[PDB]
Amino acid sequence: SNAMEIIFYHPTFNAAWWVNALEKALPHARVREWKVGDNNPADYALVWQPPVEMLAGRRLKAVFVLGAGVDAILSKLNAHPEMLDASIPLFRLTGMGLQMQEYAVSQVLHWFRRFDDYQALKNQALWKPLPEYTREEFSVGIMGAGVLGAKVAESLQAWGFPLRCWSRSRKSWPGVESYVGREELRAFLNQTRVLINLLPNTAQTVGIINSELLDQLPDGAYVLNLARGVHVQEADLLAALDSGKLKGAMLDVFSQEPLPQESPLWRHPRVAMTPHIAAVTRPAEAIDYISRTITQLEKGEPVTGQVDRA
Amino acid sequence: SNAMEIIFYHPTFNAAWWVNALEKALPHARVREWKVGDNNPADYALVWQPPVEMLAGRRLKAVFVLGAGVDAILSKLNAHPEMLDASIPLFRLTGMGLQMQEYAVSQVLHWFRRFDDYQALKNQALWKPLPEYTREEFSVGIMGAGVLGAKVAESLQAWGFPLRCWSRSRKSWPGVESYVGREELRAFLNQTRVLINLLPNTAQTVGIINSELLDQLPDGAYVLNLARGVHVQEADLLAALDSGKLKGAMLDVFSQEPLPQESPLWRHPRVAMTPHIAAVTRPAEAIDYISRTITQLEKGEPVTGQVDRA
């Protein structure tokens, strides 16, 4: 023919910027942003929250999901077996431990040094040095196995906080007490001052952070949600913040995103919020991965990052 | 006689708690909180902002200043040569690098990840992922030589920020570009996104952070003041925050402390404030130092932490 055709679709990224970087990364490719009504052939598709008509009936060499988190797309494909011929390989971008570390280390220290309290004191123009928290009473509990959790634990134990992790599978991270299964969840929660959620999702963790879990945390605890919005029952979180069970929370993810303006979370004085930016893959990195993987496919070499479509 | 008499005075600490810990640390000592009119002998005096009548005419084996920062007391003694017989040794408690590190690392990351911006966006109930800052453009500049500055630099370069330091004396900290003298101050400021002040004081640094210095920082910079209040010209800081020269500031120290409620700093939305708590010596540590040093003096052994009364 024989030009390589690539199509690109993202709900909120700058298509122009991505099309460009892609053109320079794969100079021998024709890249174009996909728009409704575009049924001209393509060899590779780069997508996030793609509509059905973009991929339905397409013959493609591969689809690249623009982000980690294949749960959303897999369910659209599984609820629409007709959206992507099941023989087409699907890929995902996780090398973002650093980003998580930055976020968690900043906030855990922020809370440890009572900057949240000091900000409230500032807003009342009240000079009041507060009692200091001991490292011993400031235990960190990470929920979730996987590199992100492992990286976050590593970076926090370096500051001397007691660390514990909880997962369904038994684990052995250096300098961390490992708790396993719903059987050991209470023991884990009882001893955790700062609860950090880094669970990849599961049917078995939906709404896991609800009142039944919050009740086992010691009073004056904190919740840092870096995993999935559906892991937190928002009404229960707010109730725990209002009763004093929780001193504070920081949430990067929400049950519904963008979080509707109507949500009271926006309004709570002891909730901090970030619009799902804890760890985004740098486009340069994303582009390097995608171009590298396309090259391996064109040459029949081994690839990495393929998502099994169980 | 022969009981060892110790007297204690602090303007805001819990005298009872300190007297107690002291009694247990030196069981063989009689410790008492000093109150106006108490002219009964003592062997050692533990003080912070002592009034003249507490130390005038006293024969003492040593005075212990309850904190690092001997500038305040030395000037009261030097302006009142009659407050402490000049033959009496004076001691000070610096092993607080960790505390500074916690503070600086938390805040520099806080700013780097735009949590300040995200908080403002939260307060407007506006979901808006913001552009990310590169590490390259997020250079840290530490003013001041000495361990605290060295510790803070060490902990920040570990996160991959470009680091520079400025002092009057030439220095060589690993992984840090060293700038020396007022001659190289502009070059240093021009390249510094986050200015961290850790200068021990000098006549030559009073009001150093004024408009002439702020003007050399790149727009969108930040100031973190962890050293002395008199180092910052508060009116100029506020002006720099209002013009956009400075995106934000965090201050742990102020020209006058407690900062009068009248000060506009309390009121600025892009100033964060803490009541001089960046690095306080743990009382347990303070007590261990003082008891250890008293024991060395009683036994004629070498001591450490003595302040020359030049």
Q: Where are the domains of chain B?
A: 1-95+280-310, 97-279
Any chain A CB within 8 A of the CB of B172? no
Q: What's the resolution in A? A: 2.1
- How many Cα neighbours within 13 Å face the side chain of A125? 10
CATH superfamily of A1-95+280-310: NAD(P)-binding Rossmann-like Domain (3.40.50.720)
CA B66/CA B46 separation, integer angstroms: 6
Instruction: Locate A252 and state its tokens.
Output: 């990067």
**Residues with Cβ within 8 Å of residue B35, at least 6 apart in sequence:** none
Instruction: Locate B110 and state its tokens.
Output: 């806080």
Same fold, A1-95+280-310 and A97-279: yes
Helix axes of B115-123 and B97-112: crossing angle, nearest 10 degrees: 60
Q: How far is CA A227 from the centre of its chain?
A: 4
Any chain B CB within 8 A of the CB of A118? yes
CA A84/CA A90 separation, integer angstroms: 9
Quickly list H helices, chain A. 15-25, 52-55, 71-79, 97-112, 115-123, 147-157, 185-190, 211-214, 234-243, 283-299
The Cα of A82 is separated from the nearest Cα of chain B by a number of Å equal to 33
Q: Which residue has the tokens 């002219």?
A: B39
Chain breaks in chain A (C to N over 2.5 A) after: 93
Residues of chain B contacting A252 with CB distance shorter than 8 Å: none
Q: Which amino acid is at B232?
A: V
Experimental method: X-ray
Max Cα–Cα distance, chain B, nearest Å: 74
Instruction: Locate A104 and state its tokens.
Output: 């968690």
**Residues with Cβ within 8 Å of residue A76, at least 6 apart in sequence:** A50, A52, A83
Whether residue A234 contacts residue A255, with contact meaning beta carbons closer than 8 Å, is answered with: yes
Strands in chain B per DSSP E: 4-9, 29-33, 44-47, 62-65, 90-92, 140-143, 163-167, 177-180, 194-197, 221-225, 246-251, 271-273
Q: How far is CA A169 from the centre of its chain?
A: 20
Is the backbone of residue B276 left (phi > 0), alpha (psi -120 to 50) or beta? left
Instruction: Locate A162 and state its tokens.
Output: 């007691």
Question: How far from B299 is each of A176, A302, B287, B296, CA to CA, in Å?
Answer: 45, 74, 18, 5
Whether residue A236 contacts residue A214, with contact meaning beta carbons closer than 8 Å, is answered with: yes
- How many Cα neighbours within 13 Å face the side chain of B265? 28
- How many Cα neighbours within 13 Å face the side chain of B235? 1
Instruction: For an interface test with B, give the residue of A99, A109, A251, A281 to mutate (most B CBs within 10 A).
Output: A109
Instruction: For an interface test with A, give the residue of B266, B270, B276, B280 to mutate (most A CBs within 10 A).
Output: B266
Class of CATH domain A97-279: alpha beta
- For residue A86, count other CB atoms closer than 10 A to its CB: 10
Strand, coil or helix: B289: helix
DSSP B150: H
CA B69/CA B93 separation, integer angstroms: 9
Order of strands, sheet of A29-33, starting from the edge strand that comes earlier in the sequence? A29-33, A4-9, A44-47, A62-65, A90-92
**Residues with Cβ within 8 Å of residue B163, at least 6 apart in sequence:** B139, B140, B141, B142, B153, B156, B157, B175, B176, B177
CA A154/CA A195 separation, integer angstroms: 15
Any chain B CB within 8 A of the CB of A129? yes
CA B53/CA B75 separation, integer angstroms: 16
Question: Do A277 and B129 lie within an 8 Å CB cutoff?
Answer: yes
CA A222/CA B113 separation, integer angstroms: 20
